[PDB]
Amino acid sequence: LSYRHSFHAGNHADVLKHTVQSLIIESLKEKDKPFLYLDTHAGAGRYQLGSTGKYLEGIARIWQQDDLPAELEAYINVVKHFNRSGQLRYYPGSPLIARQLLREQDSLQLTELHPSDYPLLRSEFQKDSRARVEKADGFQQLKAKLPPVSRRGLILIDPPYEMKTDYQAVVSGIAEGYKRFATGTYALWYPVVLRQQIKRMIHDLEATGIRKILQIELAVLPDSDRRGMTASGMIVINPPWKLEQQMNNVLPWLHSKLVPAGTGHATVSWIVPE
Ligand SMILES: Nc1ncnc2c1ncn2[C@@H]1O[C@H](CNCC[C@H](N)C(=O)O)[C@@H](O)[C@H]1O
């Protein structure tokens, strides 16, 4: 099988989501008791870069910096593992960040619905039995797979929002999971195409009544109409205690490296305090 390409792989949004994902993982790993990594929309696994691409404006701009903040080391070491030649050939998606950062006793439950990617994802874990890869509706897995036998977990919800109903399924998906496993860490990625649909989403999430909801947004441009995705963010329910401080240490740096021309913003606030 051939690795999927993706013109947008490793852009600013991946750098943010994968930074945060890796920080949550390293943080859950402080205790030597297994945990579960559930990836509702897992993608293909990795992405062949080039033949160009938005990685030149994103991961390429941080991975070899001499002042790389220590809070990005875990993440950047996984990019490097997949790029031994020292140039950027492949970018690891969420499942391979997990595959590489998780220990032998940990588990991964990964769902990818699209027929193009799903075969590649499955081949990524052909000989990794800590993983279960299935072609299924990711939101459905929040009903079924929780709680995990381990009673510890990071749940990553990273939908493409190519259907506006995604703004719905994420809030009710998280409500379904939270009901069954109220102490897990849920990390929801979101693109800011039209800010309004993000404000609706955040409110429903607030309607849920769930507590301790952190917000981390990195915008490259201002809120714009018909200029595509201007920003992206991670919404973390039950963030590990020092995630907010790590993101305040590292996010200005991220923003100055990814957005050298000074547009946008980079903020770390609480959607629901606890
Ligand atoms: N309902 C869905 N269930 C599972 N997968 C879905 C669903 N809707 C879209 N998808 C796929 O999951 C991917 C969404 N991007 C996820 C990126 C991945 N988490 C990563 O970090 O690289 C795409 O490949 C979608 O085709």
Numbering used by the authors: 2 to 52, 58 to 280
Q: Can you list sentences taken from the study reporting this PDB entry?
A:
We previously designed adenosine-SAM bisubstrate analogues that contain the SAM cofactor with the S-atom replaced by a N-atom directly linked to an adenosine at the point of nucleophilic attack to mimic the substrate/cofactor bound state. Two crystal structures of RlmJ in complex with RNA–SAM conjugates were solved and revealed the RNA-specific recognition elements used by RlmJ to clamp the RNA substrate in its active site.
We first investigated whether CA could be accommodated in the RlmJ active site similarly to the SAM cofactor. The crystal structure of RlmJ bound to CA was refined to 2.1 Å and revealed a similar binding mode to that of the natural cofactor. CA and SAH exhibit the same conformations and positioning of both the methionine chain and the adenosine moiety in the active site of RlmJ. This structure therefore validates the use of this SAM analogue for the design of RNA–SAM conjugates presented in this paper. Interestingly, H9 swaps conformation from solvent exposed in the RlmJ/CA structure, to buried in the RlmJ/GA* structure, from where it can π-stack with Asub.
